[model samples]
Target: TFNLFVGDLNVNVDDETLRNAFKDFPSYLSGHVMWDMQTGSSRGYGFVSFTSQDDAQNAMDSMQGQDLNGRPLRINWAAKLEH
Candidate 1:
């Protein structure tokens, strides 16, 4: 599964809140907010998955650089980690 990188997040944001923010994107499939283990709060970032790369790209183009909850959300393809 592919994960989307969402940055510039709001401290008050949660997974459900983040998902609802981009539910308008037709390409959106599923998503989740990355949270801090100790505080159990958003890490000012999250991930979203789309059905296809094209759809994901489209959503990124439209959603990225847009303001959400007074924070400009940065959406882009998640980089695969080499381990």
Candidate 2:
């Protein structure tokens, strides 16, 4: 389960939206929007998972190099986590 960090998210974006956006790839596992529980708002970021490096590269190349939902999206090779 390779996860990619996505940022610069629109307020209108949702989990289903992201999942659908990444559904083009067979290697795609899932995509989700991060929402704050208490504040009940977007975190300005999300996640996308793929099974293969080529899939990740291609998806990122396409989305990062192009546009998603007519909005420029950010892509990170790895998803960072803090302990």
Candidate 3:
């Protein structure tokens, strides 16, 4: 599976909203908006997983450069594994 990064998030946007934004993307497996444990808030970024690269690419194309709320969403492929 591939994960897409949606960044430049609005401070008020939460997990459910983020999920809803991409709910229609095909092959969606799971998704999350990273947050700070201490603040219990978003870190201006989120991730969405797709079961196949094709689906991932579709999301990338559909969501990239799109406006969400009041911010422009930046969607890109999350690095598979890098430590």
Candidate 4:
């Protein structure tokens, strides 16, 4: 699977919202967002997983800077396992 890093998030966006955004694209596995223990709120970033490299590129190409919850998405490839 490919895990992509997503930044520039809106504070109001939740895990389900984030995940559903990519559901329009194929091969999406999951979406995870960070929450601050101190602030008890979203960290304003997250990770999205996809099972196909081809499909993943489509999301990166099309969804980059796409608005969700009033914030533009910043997308990038996160570290992946080689072995």
TM-scores of all candidate predictions against the true structure: 0.85, 0.83, 0.88, 0.86
Clashes per model (N, Cα, C within 3 A) = 0, 0, 0, 0
The lowest-lDDT stretch of 10 consecutive residues in candidate 3 is 74-83
Better of 1 and 2 by lDDT: 1
Model 4, 1-83: lDDT tens digits are 98788888999888999988887688998898888989879989889889999888889888999999999999989865258
What are the lDDT scores of the predictions, listed in order? Answer: 0.82, 0.81, 0.85, 0.87
lDDT of 3 by residue, 1-83 (tens): 78898888897888888989888888998878889999897798889998889989988898888888889898888865357
Give the per-residue lDDT of model 1 (tens digit) for 1-83.
Answer: 54579988998888888889878777677878888799887788888888778778888888878998899988778986359
Sort by lDDT, best first: 4, 3, 1, 2
What's the TM for model 2? Answer: 0.83
TM-score of 3: 0.88
Please, what are the lDDT tens digits per residue for candidate 2 over residues 51-83?
Answer: 988888888877883456666798888755668
- Residue pairs in collision within model 1: none
Ten contiguous residues with the weakest lDDT in model 1: 73-82
Candidate 1: where are CA atoms >4 Å away? Answer: 80-83
